[PDB]
Amino acid sequence: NLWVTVYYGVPVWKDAETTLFCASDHNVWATHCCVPTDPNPQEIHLENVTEEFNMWKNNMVEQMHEDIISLWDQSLKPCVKLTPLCVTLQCTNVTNNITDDMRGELKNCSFNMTTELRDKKQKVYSLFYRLDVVQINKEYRLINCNTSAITQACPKVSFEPIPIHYCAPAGFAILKCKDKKFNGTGPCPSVSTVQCTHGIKPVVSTQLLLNGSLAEEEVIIRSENITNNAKNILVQLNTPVQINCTRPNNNTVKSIRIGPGQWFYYTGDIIGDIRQAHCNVSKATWNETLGKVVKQLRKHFGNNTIIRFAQSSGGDLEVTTHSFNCGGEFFYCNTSGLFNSTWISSNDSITLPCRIKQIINMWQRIGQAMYAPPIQGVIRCVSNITGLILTRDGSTTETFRPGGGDMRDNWRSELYKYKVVKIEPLGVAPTRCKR
Amino acid sequence: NLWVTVYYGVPVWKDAETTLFCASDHNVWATHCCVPTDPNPQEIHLENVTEEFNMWKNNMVEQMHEDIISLWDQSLKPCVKLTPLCVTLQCTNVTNNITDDMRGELKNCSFNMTTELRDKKQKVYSLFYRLDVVQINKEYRLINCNTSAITQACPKVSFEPIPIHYCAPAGFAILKCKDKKFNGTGPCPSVSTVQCTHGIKPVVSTQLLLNGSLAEEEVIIRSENITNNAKNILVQLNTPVQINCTRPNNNTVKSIRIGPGQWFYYTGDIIGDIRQAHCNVSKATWNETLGKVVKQLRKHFGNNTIIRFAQSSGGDLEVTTHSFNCGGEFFYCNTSGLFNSTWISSNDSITLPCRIKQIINMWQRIGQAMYAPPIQGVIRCVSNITGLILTRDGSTTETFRPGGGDMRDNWRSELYKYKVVKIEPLGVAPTRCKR
Amino acid sequence: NLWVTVYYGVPVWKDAETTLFCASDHNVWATHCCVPTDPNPQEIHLENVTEEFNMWKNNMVEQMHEDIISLWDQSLKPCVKLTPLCVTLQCTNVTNNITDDMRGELKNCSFNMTTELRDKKQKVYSLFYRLDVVQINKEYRLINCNTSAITQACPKVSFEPIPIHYCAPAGFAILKCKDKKFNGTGPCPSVSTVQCTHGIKPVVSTQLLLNGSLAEEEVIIRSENITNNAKNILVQLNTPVQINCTRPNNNTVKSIRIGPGQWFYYTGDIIGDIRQAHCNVSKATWNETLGKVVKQLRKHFGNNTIIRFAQSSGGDLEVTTHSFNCGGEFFYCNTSGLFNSTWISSNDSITLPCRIKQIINMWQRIGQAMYAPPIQGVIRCVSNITGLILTRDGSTTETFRPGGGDMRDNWRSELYKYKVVKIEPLGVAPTRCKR
Amino acid sequence: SLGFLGAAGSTMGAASMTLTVQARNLLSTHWGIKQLQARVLAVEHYLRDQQLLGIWGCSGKLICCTNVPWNSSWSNRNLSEIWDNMTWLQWDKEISNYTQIIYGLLEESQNQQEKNEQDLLALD
Amino acid sequence: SLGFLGAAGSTMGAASMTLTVQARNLLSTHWGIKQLQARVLAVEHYLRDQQLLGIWGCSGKLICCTNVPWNSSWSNRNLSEIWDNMTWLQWDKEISNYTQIIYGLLEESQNQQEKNEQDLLALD
Amino acid sequence: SLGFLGAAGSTMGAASMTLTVQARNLLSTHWGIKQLQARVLAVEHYLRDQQLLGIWGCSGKLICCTNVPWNSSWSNRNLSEIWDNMTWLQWDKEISNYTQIIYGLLEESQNQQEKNEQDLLALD
Ligand SMILES: *[C@@H]1O[C@H](CO)[C@@H](O[C@@H]2O[C@H](CO)[C@@H](O[C@@H]3O[C@H](CO[C@H]4O[C@H](CO)[C@@H](O)[C@H](O)[C@@H]4O)[C@@H](O)[C@H](O[C@H]4O[C@H](CO)[C@@H](O)[C@H](O)[C@@H]4O)[C@@H]3O)[C@H](O)[C@H]2NC(C)=O)[C@H](O)[C@H]1NC(C)=O
Ligand SMILES: *[C@@H]1O[C@H](CO)[C@@H](O[C@@H]2O[C@H](CO)[C@@H](O)[C@H](O)[C@H]2NC(C)=O)[C@H](O)[C@H]1NC(C)=O
Ligand SMILES: *[C@@H]1O[C@H](CO)[C@@H](O[C@@H]2O[C@H](CO)[C@@H](O)[C@H](O)[C@H]2NC(C)=O)[C@H](O)[C@H]1NC(C)=O
Ligand SMILES: *[C@@H]1O[C@H](CO)[C@@H](O[C@@H]2O[C@H](CO)[C@@H](O)[C@H](O)[C@H]2NC(C)=O)[C@H](O)[C@H]1NC(C)=O
Ligand SMILES: *[C@@H]1O[C@H](CO)[C@@H](O[C@@H]2O[C@H](CO)[C@@H](O)[C@H](O)[C@H]2NC(C)=O)[C@H](O)[C@H]1NC(C)=O
Ligand SMILES: *[C@@H]1O[C@H](CO)[C@@H](O[C@@H]2O[C@H](CO)[C@@H](O)[C@H](O)[C@H]2NC(C)=O)[C@H](O)[C@H]1NC(C)=O
Ligand SMILES: *[C@@H]1O[C@H](CO)[C@@H](O[C@@H]2O[C@H](CO)[C@@H](O)[C@H](O)[C@H]2NC(C)=O)[C@H](O)[C@H]1NC(C)=O
Ligand SMILES: *[C@@H]1O[C@H](CO)[C@@H](O[C@@H]2O[C@H](CO)[C@@H](O)[C@H](O)[C@H]2NC(C)=O)[C@H](O)[C@H]1NC(C)=O
Ligand SMILES: *[C@@H]1O[C@H](CO)[C@@H](O[C@@H]2O[C@H](CO)[C@@H](O)[C@H](O)[C@H]2NC(C)=O)[C@H](O)[C@H]1NC(C)=O
Ligand SMILES: *[C@@H]1O[C@H](CO)[C@@H](O)[C@H](O)[C@H]1NC(C)=O
Ligand SMILES: *[C@@H]1O[C@H](CO)[C@@H](O)[C@H](O)[C@H]1NC(C)=O
Ligand SMILES: *[C@@H]1O[C@H](CO)[C@@H](O)[C@H](O)[C@H]1NC(C)=O
Ligand SMILES: *[C@@H]1O[C@H](CO)[C@@H](O)[C@H](O)[C@H]1NC(C)=O
Ligand SMILES: *[C@@H]1O[C@H](CO)[C@@H](O)[C@H](O)[C@H]1NC(C)=O
Ligand SMILES: *[C@@H]1O[C@H](CO)[C@@H](O)[C@H](O)[C@H]1NC(C)=O
């Protein structure tokens, strides 16, 4: 005695994969390409809706990866090509004001490079940081000469992260997980619907995550499979750890024409003493932070067991040391003073030595190299450590080491709260109404 | 006891901005980017409709400006690059057939040019006009060597303007002002609706507008604010002034290969006397034209005010000197002979001397330079002056001078009749009908 | 007393021209740009429907041609440019182990090539096939260093034809002719509707059509106008003829770096003796095939005539010989042994000598030259002749020659059964109801 | 039991029962442009047909009976000669010269119908 | 007719006689993107207006009467004043403030009507 | 009220009064292509559902009662269980296996109804 009744505008949805667009709010993220945001966004709480989230199968991460790389490459399209620099360099050591920490790190190179006119050359003198120069046999070449084309980054374009809001297209919605102590893979008892995400800054780093969100109550340890030693562990911190990084040298930056309409920037000289770049982390804060991490790890690995921290086992510098963009310079900072402790159930800082490199190969690609022009003056930056990337060695003692290098993990950490669903407004149910 | 009635198809609209497309009517203004026009375009007169127009805030102008630049740049994309020419030139003077009008206006330069094969060179000589060559310290270089890349315009692509009609998308309409003697900013008592504008030739010039529309009855003086000396005055003539321009030299054009698939064009030599380029206008026509302008200009200044004309005070050649594209050559003509008079309450022409420049930097941009290949033989063109661009000096006898340098003014001159509105077919009103 | 009734969803159509898209099924063409096909495609037979088809006015062919050229060009965009090879080569022909078939068909050339560093040069020795090397005045250059510029094809990308399905957009459908012995221009008594064509392999060839479809019962001769000597004749075979092609020379391939991330590939030397490339066609099969062709030609020219086959009258190698891609190698085979017979009303093979060419100007274009990297080892391929391209000459004897090219006639041999129509679902008819 | 256009060639009467089959199959690097143009065009054609049905007052129906009488000048056949002995392809060709007359009349008829209804409701 | 928007300037009670005319004109390398955006935009606007009518309960109608009473606070006129001595451009300005109020009432009324219809149909 | 999907999780009965809220929020440098593709999908979806409503005879309604009886084999439940103790997400999952069957039946019913209407008008 029941009849089919059709309803349109039914509040249901399905998991779906669609293309999201950016909304933002000169720079390397080409934010002028985004649709400006709504000053008064809404969040609609969904009472009595429990949804399954899975941060590891989330394709929002894959899109963020594809767009960050694409934006990055587009920003270099109009920039000066440095092909003329792949010449033999004649290099000697910088020895005039050295503290012996930087023994051999800087090199004073000279070379024959072109001028505005094709029939004329000029002799150029410049400084290199050793990591970016390789010996040929005092004859050197740049490291990119046998693998890639080199492009100078445009000096007018900032690399500072700008928050990006991702927005679902009409017909789709983004569900956000509001639960505290949520590890990213289980059911989420409290959710809400938003059209656009929290702005996410595309901060790029390895080993330790910088300037992200904080855990609401306690350190949260997230992994695809915690017992699989091959997986990375993303640890979100409850409170930030402050880190102060610097390149404590007053650099004089010079530039020359290399061809019509094009100029090259290089470090001319250094004023005063030459000192090693470094980062400062407070010891007490760092030791408390690890204690919190260890407690949470014991919940998975045992109270009657031992947790030991150790340095990355080895591999490429881009993976094994900490890396970040500070003022536009690229830093490679050792983490050995951060992960050297065995945990068994003071106004002082940890000083981390750092290296500087001018030739950069991002996103783990080969054939596309970028030259970061040097910055005049002295650079200092302060940032918050908001999470860690750890791996585990394959007894009673477990060893954890810094890991990462796969950029999708940094994003994944920020996007863990969101999933995209398709709205399916049309459906049927039996009623007593017939016609 | 009235009820709401909903009506759809209601003939109302709002001011709006949108994307317009071209309908046209081997060429820089590619028609490959357009659709055909209707053979029978429609126009609808609107009785009892008065609209507000403001030509100074008309976004059709901004959009036309951007389309033209984009078409221009695309036309050079596949053309021969001339980087190999930026070498030291060995130059002497062309003194062979000089009347002293052209003394110093031509140089005879030799250089070591590239060839099809990488391992070969050729010695080439060519002529330059001084304006495009700068002395290095008889050692010269092209003017673009220290600022821009130079691209040769394709010899097969015409710079002759094709009138382009602009068309609104469905849902939008263009209202046109039919009020004769309309100054562009007030209410327009007589309007009509069209879907496409008349075709507008994208003529490029400064100071004197060429080949535009004429005022229906009287000279019309239009300005954003007539008392603001920071604004230009656009004067639309009700009669054309004929101007006859020439480059009275028989050029022999030479061509060489510069690399695989590429060739460079240049003037080899000149047959006969070397003469200065020039333009002629009738003295009587020009003096009558100014008298009409002055009579109308006085409406905003008084009959106790003396109106004086003077030459531009200075600045770059592209602004102070009249310019246009004639036969494919770029002319820079001196208008001081036209604007030199004070106005107080038969077979005799005015000759304006002109210079020719081969390296072109349009839209006042730096970094994109075009090389205009030579035109073989002798050039003559005839055109109509349809309006003037004037500026006014900062306690009696107001002085006016030729203006320009901003192309949006030429477009505003043609696009003062049209505005874009969005059609809004849905609305409500009270009736005696309910259900 | 009849009334108009409107029906929607009416099964009618009109002939139409729309844009079709590719649907797929390390390739040169971007197969990744296509959408995967329907796992279970449908075909609907239309009973009692006769439609007119015209293979010579079919716009599907024109799109296929355009798409293939564009896809091809896309594949070379990221590949190494070989501009630095346009130097004088010093050559002395290889004469180490020859049979006098290859005398003068190979050349041992040396040149000064660039290196990663701009400061260095390297001497390179390589072998060329003569067709690609032209004497300059022992001084030679590559043939395509004046009219063009050369791009090296990427060695990892395959030229093997991959069948591509074409699919109509919603609102359009493709009518497929299923009529045995259909000549391409008349009414087709039995048709069906499909959304996608079968996949068609983009096989590129001249003289003979390789790896296509076969006629159901008899050889079918199709032409736009059989009496017009300006038109080509497409002959579809009902049986394949097997052809075995080879380059029986074991090449040693070497490579050098030519720049920062760029490398050039070339033949270093030959292991063993030097032998000519050739193709084998069985005599009995080929003679049976021609007999069938002749019978079908008599039906159009008379049953009391003489049909004579002859080789090409002359012209460029690309149109006088049988061009095909074998293993990625480019062959130019002589068909004079196939078309030399007058027809009047046990492992014995025909050997066709073939030449090899590395610099290829595809699609009868000028300015875009491709360099085909050498293939290490020995090449053998076996393919099916599925049709012939013939031309007819201006007595009692009709003379036919192989005719090829235009890269539209080859496609027409597969795209002759398909027509695109627009669905027109709305219409009216008289009936009995009113309101 | 027929697929898309499987009724083509059948009589108009028989084909009128598959209208749903055709209707439901409507809508159903330069490459990005080709896909967008294909999608956009399919939508534009769909919407123009729907707008026209809307104007005529047939927006929700596959078979819509209107108030415009049939003129023998368009076609003077018997209803059998049309519905039992012709297919839709043939019919469309036979009356292709009256299409815009019929469509204009349909627009006028519906506009008159809407006005009459609005006034009756206002009346009482 | 007067052609597209030719009725503008005419009083409301006269302009409304030719609504069809403005309905048919709602659907009638960047170069390709500018054109796709223009085409997509026209469709989006068309559909948004059509959805409002559908929500309010009007489907293919150019003129539809609802059950929402007119408030004198929105506009206090002699009715003949509006239909005989005012044009649509003027009217649209006069009540532009109340646009959202009226639209909200139209949605509410129809939602109530649909529920009421469902209950009555269930009765038997 | 609750701006969008606010009723999700409420019972099916309670949520029936927010159909308007969800319906009105539907359809509301190569980064230009991604934006066009998204805008086009917003139109293709939506427009596709409108077609189904059209075919089923529900073109102008948020709530549409048809003449197809409910089969207990799709779901053997008390109406009070369905409307008071379940939400729409749960319901849709329980009968997601029968959706195609129901949709096919709805199309058949409407087609039969249009033919029957045409014959009655012809007889009247
Ligand atoms: C008409 O139709 C025929 C039949 O389809 C085509 O003939 C085929 O052409 C393809 C492409 O040239 C051939 O594929 C190649 O085979 C090589 C040999 O591999 C076979 O033989 C070895 C013997 O030791 C076996 O171990 C092996 O399993 C195979 O059975 C491969 O070496 C080739 O791969 C190399 O090149 C590709 C890029 O193209 C790289 O990606 C690989 O890594 C590798 O370097 C390739 O697979 C196929 O064998 C041919 N079939 C026959 C029967 O001969 C005709 O080409 C076609 N005519 C025209 C004009 O298109
Ligand atoms: C320039 O710097 C290099 C290091 O980059 C110095 O090389 C080292 O020299 C010491 C002393 O002889 C050796 O013990 C190290 O093993 C060398 N290092 C490497 C990597 O080989 C070099 O001596 C310095 N030159 C000058 C003049 O100071
Ligand atoms: C994150 O929390 C979820 C629970 O919300 C954990 O999922 C359970 O894992 C066990 C294995 O230890 C399975 O037997 C259960 O069936 C899972 N339950 C659910 C609801 O999925 C998950 O393991 C936790 N992950 C981490 C890294 O803490
Ligand atoms: C163009 O005409 C308008 C009138 O239609 C002029 O604008 C008026 O200027 C007076 C002052 O002289 C003001 O008091 C009025 O309020 C203005 N009216 C309007 C509608 O703006 C305008 O100045 C004229 N401009 C030119 C260049 O002639
Ligand atoms: C039109 O131009 C006149 C200048 O002639 C502007 O008048 C000046 O406005 C500023 C700012 O209020 C005052 O400080 C000056 O004293 C005014 N000058 C005179 C002579 O009165 C006028 O504001 C401009 N009008 C518009 C609409 O832009
Ligand atoms: C393909 O077959 C059709 C018949 O179906 C041929 O068409 C006829 O051509 C003659 C030419 O003298 C015309 O007079 C007839 O009126 C045509 N008949 C029809 C039905 O169109 C066609 O010429 C044949 N083409 C080839 C290449 O064989
Ligand atoms: C097919 O080609 C023949 C030519 O081979 C065309 O016939 C010629 O038509 C012109 C114009 O009427 C006559 O002056 C010639 O004398 C004809 N030549 C012969 C040999 O008959 C024929 O018209 C073409 N068919 C079609 C359909 O275009
Ligand atoms: C524009 O306004 C005039 C009035 O000024 C309208 O003309 C009147 O139309 C009515 C109705 O047909 C006649 O009774 C009057 O006698 C006309 N008056 C005059 C002075 O002619 C005219 O119709 C309006 N135009 C439009 C398009 O609505
Ligand atoms: C979420 O579930 C709770 C529990 O069933 C709902 O709470 C009921 O709300 C009604 C209406 O206000 C009250 O009469 C009942 O007494 C409440 N039940 C209880 C146990 O307190 C709540 O309304 C649901 N949320 C939504 C959005 O539907
Ligand atoms: C520049 O070239 C000259 C060539 O004679 C060479 O002697 C000199 O060492 C080169 N200079 C540098 C810094 O390489
Ligand atoms: C070309 O190069 C040679 C190098 O020896 C130089 O002497 C000659 O002056 C150059 N010619 C020109 C025109 O610059
Ligand atoms: C390479 O350059 C030298 C320069 O002295 C020249 O003698 C030699 O012939 C060149 N080699 C070739 C193969 O042309
Ligand atoms: C190739 O030539 C060498 C040198 O004469 C000879 O030793 C070798 O046997 C030859 N190979 C063949 C296959 O003839
Ligand atoms: C084709 O005609 C036959 C009668 O000869 C008829 O039975 C059949 O149904 C027709 N085909 C179609 C698709 O209507
Ligand atoms: C109800 O569903 C069952 C199972 O699919 C089917 O066998 C039965 O015929 C259906 N009832 C009716 C009236 O069709």
Angle between helices E31-56 and D31-56 (to 10 degrees): 30
Asked if E44 reaches chain A (Cβ–Cβ under 8 Å), the answer is no
Place of tokens 């260093």: C145
Exposed, middle or buried, F79 (CB in 10 Å: 0-12/13-18/19+)? middle
Angle between helices D31-56 and D99-123 (to 10 degrees): 60
Query: What Å distances lie between residue C265 and B4, C374, C375, CA to CA?
Result: 80, 7, 9
Exposed, middle or buried, A394 (CB in 10 Å: 0-12/13-18/19+)? exposed
Q: Where are the alpha helices (DSSP H) in A217-359?
A: 283-301, 317-320
Q: What angle do CA C221, C227, C228 make, to 5 degrees?
A: 105
Neighbours of F31 (CB within 10 A): 16
As given in the structure block, the two tokens for residue C343 are 């027809």
As given in the structure block, the two tokens for residue B254 are 């030479």
Kind of pairing between the strands at A306-309 and A341-344: antiparallel
Measuring CA to CA, which residue among B163, B278, B279 is closest to residue B212?
A: B163
Q: Which residues of E touch D124 (CB under 8 A)?
A: none
Q: Which residues of B touch D122 (CB under 8 A)?
A: 431-434
The residues, ordered by sequence, that sit 6+ positions from C403 with a Cβ below 8 Å of its Cβ are C207, C232, C233, C312, C389, C390, C391
DSSP letters spanning A139-205? EEEEGGGGT-EEEEPPTTSB-----B-EEPPTTEEEEEE--TT--SSSEESSEEEESBPPPB-----
Ligand nearest to the CA of C223: 6
**B387, B234 in Cβ contact below 8 A?**
yes
Q: Which residues of A touch C260 (CB under 8 A)?
A: 83, 86, 144-150
- Using CB atoms, pick whichever of B86, B150, B367 lies closest to residue A117: B86
State the Cα–Cα distance between residues C414 and C429, nearest whole angstrom: 39
**B9, B425 in Cβ contact below 8 A?**
yes
Exposed, middle or buried, A6 (CB in 10 Å: 0-12/13-18/19+)? buried
Entry field: residues in chain B: 435
DSSP-derived 3-state class of residue F93: helix
**B33, E31 in Cβ contact below 8 A?**
yes
CA C331 to chain centre: 12
**C230, C391 in Cβ contact below 8 A?**
no
DSSP-derived 3-state class of residue A298: helix
Kind of pairing between the strands at A277-282 and A233-259: antiparallel
State the Cα–Cα distance between residues A11 and A9, nearest whole angstrom: 6
- D60/chain F closest Cα distance in angstroms: 6
Query: Which mutation among F4, F5, F10, F83 tests ligand 9's pocket best, with the greatest number of atoms within 8 A of CB?
Result: F10
As given in the structure block, the two tokens for residue A274 are 């030459």
The residues, ordered by sequence, that sit 6+ positions from B241 with a Cβ below 8 Å of its Cβ are B281, B282, B285, B286, B289, B384, B385
As given in the structure block, the two tokens for residue C164 are 């591509």
DSSP letters spanning D45-93? HHHHHHHHHHHHT-TT-SEEEEEEEPPTTT----HHHHHTT--HHHHHH
State the Cα–Cα distance between residues E3 and B173, nearest whole angstrom: 13
Give me the torsion for CA of B178, B180, B184, B188, rounded to 10°: -50
The residues, ordered by sequence, that sit 6+ positions from A407 with a Cβ below 8 Å of its Cβ are A65, A68, A204, A363
Class of CATH domain C3-78+157-427? mainly beta
The residues, ordered by sequence, that sit 6+ positions from B302 with a Cβ below 8 Å of its Cβ are none
**A177, A417 in Cβ contact below 8 A?**
yes
Residue E42: enclosing H or E segment and its boundaries?
A: helix E31-56
Phi, psi of E118, deg, nearest 5: -60, -40
DSSP-derived 3-state class of residue C418: strand
Q: What angle do CA B31, B37, B41 make, to 5 degrees?
A: 160
For C195-225, b/e burial (b = at least 16 CB within 10 A) is bbbbbbebbbbbbbbbebbebeeebbbbbbe
**C247, C106 in Cβ contact below 8 A?**
no
State the Cα–Cα distance between residues C323 and B230, nearest whole angstrom: 70
**A428, A4 in Cβ contact below 8 A?**
yes
State the Cα–Cα distance between residues A280 and B2, nearest whole angstrom: 77
Long-range contacts of residues A224-228, Cβ cutoff 8 Å, at least 24 apart: A224/A56, A224/A185, A226/A300, A227/A300
Exposed, middle or buried, B292 (CB in 10 Å: 0-12/13-18/19+)? middle
DSSP letters spanning B382-415? EEEEEEEEEEE----S-EEEE----THHHHHHHT
Shortest CA distance from C73: residue in chain D:
D29
What experiment produced this structure?
cryo-EM
Amino acid at the residue A389: I
Neighbouring chains of A at 3+ CB pairs under 8 Å are B, C, E, F
Contact (CB<8Å) A434/E119? no
State the Cα–Cα distance between residues D20 and C272, nearest whole angstrom: 71
State the Cα–Cα distance between residues A321 and F26, nearest whole angstrom: 48
Q: C384 has which bridge partners?
A: C242
Half-sphere exposure at residue C431, Cβ-oriented, CA atoms within 13 angstroms: 26
3-state helix, strand and coil shares in percent for chain C, rounded to the nearest 5? 10, 40, 45
Q: Where are the alpha helices (DSSP H) in C212-371?
A: 283-301, 317-320
Q: Where are the alpha helices (DSSP H) in C373-420?
A: 409-412
Residue D116: enclosing H or E segment and its boundaries?
A: helix D99-123
State the Cα–Cα distance between residues A311 and A288, nearest whole angstrom: 19
As given in the structure block, the two tokens for residue A128 are 């290199």
Residue A36: DSSP 8-state: P
* Residue ranges covered by each domain of chain C: 3-78+157-427
Measuring CA to CA, which residue among A224, A228, A215 is closest to residue A182?
A: A215
Asked if B282 reaches chain A (Cβ–Cβ under 8 Å), the answer is no
Numbered residues of chain C with Cβ closer than 8 Å to any chain D Cβ: 2-13, 18-19, 21, 30, 33, 42, 44-49, 70, 74, 169-171, 173, 193, 423-435
Exposed, middle or buried, F92 (CB in 10 Å: 0-12/13-18/19+)? buried
The residues, ordered by sequence, that sit 6+ positions from A31 with a Cβ below 8 Å of its Cβ are A22, A24, A25, A162, A164
Exposed, middle or buried, B22 (CB in 10 Å: 0-12/13-18/19+)? buried
Q: Which residues of C touch D6 (CB under 8 A)?
A: 11, 44-46, 193
Residue F41: enclosing H or E segment and its boundaries?
A: helix F31-56
Half-sphere exposure at residue C368, Cβ-oriented, CA atoms within 13 angstroms: 14
Phi, psi of C323, deg, nearest 5: -95, 135
Residue B359: enclosing H or E segment and its boundaries?
A: strand B359-360
Phi, psi of A205, deg, nearest 5: -160, 165
As given in the structure block, the two tokens for residue C356 are 């090899």
Shortest CA distance from E118: residue in chain A:
A433
Exposed, middle or buried, D50 (CB in 10 Å: 0-12/13-18/19+)? buried
At what resolution in Å was this solved?
Answer: 3.6
As given in the structure block, the two tokens for residue B323 are 């310019």
**B116, C146 in Cβ contact below 8 A?**
yes
Q: How far is the CA of B102 from the centre of ligand 15 (A)?
A: 101
**A422, A20 in Cβ contact below 8 A?**
no
Neighbours of A240 (CB within 10 A): 17
As given in the structure block, the two tokens for residue F92 are 């849709």
DSSP-derived 3-state class of residue A382: strand
The residues, ordered by sequence, that sit 6+ positions from A213 with a Cβ below 8 Å of its Cβ are A198, A236, A386, A414
The residues, ordered by sequence, that sit 6+ positions from B360 with a Cβ below 8 Å of its Cβ are B330, B369, B370, B371, B372
Asked if B156 reaches chain C (Cβ–Cβ under 8 Å), the answer is no
Q: Which residues of C touch F122 (CB under 8 A)?
A: 431-433
**C222, C184 in Cβ contact below 8 A?**
yes
**B164, B200 in Cβ contact below 8 A?**
yes
Contact (CB<8Å) E65/B18? no
Neighbours of B225 (CB within 10 A): 10
Measuring CA to CA, which residue among C199, C207, C186 is closest to residue C53?
A: C186
Ligand nearest to the CA of A235: 3
Q: Which residues line ligand 10 (CB under 6 A)?
A: A 88, 90, 110-112, 123
State the Cα–Cα distance between residues A323 and C22, nearest whole angstrom: 45
Query: Which mutation among E10, E11, E21 tests ligand 8's pocket best, with the greatest number of atoms within 8 A of CB?
Result: E10
Exposed, middle or buried, C34 (CB in 10 Å: 0-12/13-18/19+)? buried
DSSP-derived 3-state class of residue A281: strand
Asked if E92 reaches chain B (Cβ–Cβ under 8 Å), the answer is yes
DSSP letters spanning B38-87? PSS--EEEETT--EE--GGG-HHHHHHHHHHHHHHHHHHTTSPB-GGG-S
Touching, E vs A (3+ Cβ pairs under 8 A) = yes
Q: A344 has which bridge partners?
A: A306
